[PDB]
Design a binder for this molecule. Structure first.
Ligand SMILES: *[C@@H]1O[C@H](CO)[C@@H](O)[C@H](O)[C@H]1NC(C)=O
Lengths: 24, 50
């Protein structure tokens, strides 16, 4: 069987604090 | 064998892989910590972050 993942499964890519920013 | 030429003699090896990260430290060099100062211009070092 299958289902849609939507926008699940994203994680913090590194141990650096950031705020009010768009990061590639 | 002890008669081997130097290229065919045994060598012991250690590779130190440093886990250098933007992360909490648990291995540090033999460096003395000071007290902390606030609301004043200072030179600083936190875990080698100068
Ligand atoms: C992909 O998932 C949907 C439900 O999200 C499902 O209906 C579909 O059968 C799946 N695709 C294939 C090729 O089976």
């Amino acid at each position: 069987a299958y289902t849609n993942s939507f926008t699940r499964g994203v994680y913090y890519p590194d141990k650096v604090f950031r705020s009010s920013v768009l990061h590639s | 064998q002890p008669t081997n030429g130097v290229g065919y003699q045994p060598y012991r090896v250690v590779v130190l892989s440093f886990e250098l990260l933007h992360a909490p430290a648990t291995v540090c060099g033999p460096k003395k910590s000071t007290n902390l100062v606030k609301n004043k211009c200072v030179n600083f070092n936190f875990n080698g972050l100068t």
